[PDB]
Design a binder for this molecule. Structure first.
Ligand SMILES: Nc1ncnc2c1ncn2[C@@H]1O[C@H](CSCC[C@H](N)C(=O)O)[C@@H](O)[C@H]1O
Length: 252
């Protein structure tokens, strides 16, 4: 109830992102699909097939039910496995691969990132898109320097000092009211990611902050904006939303 606006905002951003890169009869691969909270958004997008994959069986389970009890028109598929630090071969390619609030987990180790980016590349059709929403390292480090690493909605704490450069840290603890607790998150080495992808035939096509992206899409699509209590957002709520950014790669 307290994090309602944040959730609405986030779903909105995801709904818009999905809208911008999907078209009818499209095939989507949803990595880190969680409980399938995007099936509805994809239903409206008129997609033909949806493949959800998540490492946590408990989430893939709730996702199966959601798809099982919803009025959808697309063919669904779910699989509980590791799509980042373990090889993945679903035997097919998709038009759109989506990774919402999950791809930063692929930065566990250099090997994990490599495997992860390779699972993406072999499942993406030539011309396909890989849309994602990941925490922004720049934002997070800049907030660290300002001493504002938290509020009543969330809380973040980095690694140990002891001559350790602020740029040396690779992970941090993240907590979100009514959500994850002391969740270990890995920073997104942006450049390494771009490089890894550029080497697999995928190039950066988009990078925009949640807040900015939010403002733009809401002032362009006042329609889907009325579908919920959008419009404004307190300062404390923006803190949380302002953590993530939109990144979109494309397979030439
Ligand atoms: N290697 C991996 N493969 C697939 N999912 C992973 C993963 N590591 C972490 N995750 C998943 O990442 C998800 C992040 S939150 C899931 C939210 C969902 N994409 C949404 O848009 O609401 C969790 O469900 C977690 O289990």
């Amino acid at each position: 109830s307290k994090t309602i606006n944040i959730r609405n905002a986030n779903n909105f951003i995801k709904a818009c992102l999905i809208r911008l890169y999907t078209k009818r009869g499209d095939s989507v691969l949803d990595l880190g699909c969680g409980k399938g909270g995007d099936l509805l958004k994809y239903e409206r997008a008129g997609i033909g097939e949806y493949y959800g994959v998540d490492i946590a069986e408990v989430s893939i389970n709730d996702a199966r039910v959601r798809a099982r009890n919803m009025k959808r028109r697309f063919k669904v598929f779910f699989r509980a496995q590791d799509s980042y630090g373990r090889h993945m071969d679903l035997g097919k390619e998709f038009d759109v691969i989506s990774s919402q609030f999950s791809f930063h987990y692929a930065f566990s180790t250099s090997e994990s990132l490599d495997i992860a980016q390779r699972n993406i590349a072999r499942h993406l059709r030539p011309g396909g898109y890989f849309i994602m929403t990941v925490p922004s390292r720049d934002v997070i480090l800049e907030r660290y320097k300002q001493g504002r690493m938290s509020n009543d909605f969330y809380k973040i704490e980095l690694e140990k000092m002891e001559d350790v450069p602020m740029e040396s840290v690779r992970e941090y603890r993240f907590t979100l009211l009514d959500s994850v607790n002391n969740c270990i998150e890995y920073f997104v080495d942006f450049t390494r990611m771009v490089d890894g992808f550029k080497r697999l035939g995928l190039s950066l096509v988009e990078r925009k902050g949640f807040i900015d992206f939010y403002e733009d899409e809401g002032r362009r699509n006042p329609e889907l904006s009325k579908k919920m209590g959008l419009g404004c957002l307190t300062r404390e709520e923006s803190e949380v939303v302002g953590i993530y950014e939109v990144v979109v790669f494309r397979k030439l």
